[PDB]
């Protein structure tokens, strides 16, 4: 009779997707990335800063 929308209404959200539950559990909408400070190249950055 009526369309109940996800992005609120967590009940119908779970009704359409259990990965909502496990997603919220492991907190993947705010998931951290392993920081790795690799470097760029001198040729790239001087080509960039080439006025």
């Amino acid at each position: 009779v009526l369309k109940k929308n996800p992005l609120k209404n967590k009940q119908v959200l779970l009704r359409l997707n259990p990965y909502a539950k496990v997603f919220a559990a492991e907190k993947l909408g705010s998931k951290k990335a392993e920081k790795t400070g690799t470097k760029p190249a001198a040729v790239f950055t001087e080509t960039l800063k080439h006025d």
Binding site: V43, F44, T47, H50
Partner: protein, 53 residues
Amino acid sequence: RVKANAAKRAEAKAQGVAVQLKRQPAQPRESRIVSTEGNVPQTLAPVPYETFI
């Protein structure tokens, strides 16, 4: 193209290897890595207006 398609179907009767016979348009292209060695980028900018008469 028709007789060549028949040749492809013959090869797939020989091995069963999923021809995908139909033509398809120029699909958008895939990634790649262009290098820079001997190929540094020349910075460009416009040229002023000279009348040239």
